[PDB]
Amino acid sequence: LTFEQYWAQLESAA
Amino acid sequence: ETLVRPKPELLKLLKSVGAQKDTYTMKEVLFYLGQYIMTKRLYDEKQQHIVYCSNDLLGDLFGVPSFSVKEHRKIYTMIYRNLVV
Numbered sequence: 563l564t565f566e567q568y569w570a571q572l573e574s575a576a
Numbered sequence: 577e578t579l580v581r582p583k584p585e586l587l588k589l590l591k592s593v594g595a596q597k598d599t600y601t602m603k604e605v606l607f608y609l610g611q612y613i614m615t616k617r618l619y620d621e622k623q624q625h626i627v628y629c630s631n632d633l634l635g636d637l638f639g640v641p642s643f644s645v646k647e648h649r650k651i652y653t654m655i656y657r658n659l660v661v
Binding site: 564572 | 601603613614619624625646651652
């Protein structure tokens with residue numbers, strides 16, 4: 563879903 | 577591979593979605609936090625970057641009724657306010 567792909571984006575900074 | 581230590585409220589959140597440790601990579605912290613939010617279905621259906629956390633342990637950690645998953649810094653900031661250092 564869209565939330566998972568906004569959240570996946572978020573993980574790239576970690 | 578930097579490990580961080582969640583303060584008790586953040587830890588409780590992680591433990592409600594199966595977290596077993598005292599320490600975590602940031603990727604892990606986000607993993608569990610991501611799962612909690614999908615699990616509890618807190619994201620907005622139409623605008624799926626919107627997360628409504630008022631009236632929830634996630635609201636207590638964050639200090640806001642909602643936020644966008646695009647506010648990357650804001651989110652990491654909340655987490656990093658909730659780490660033992």
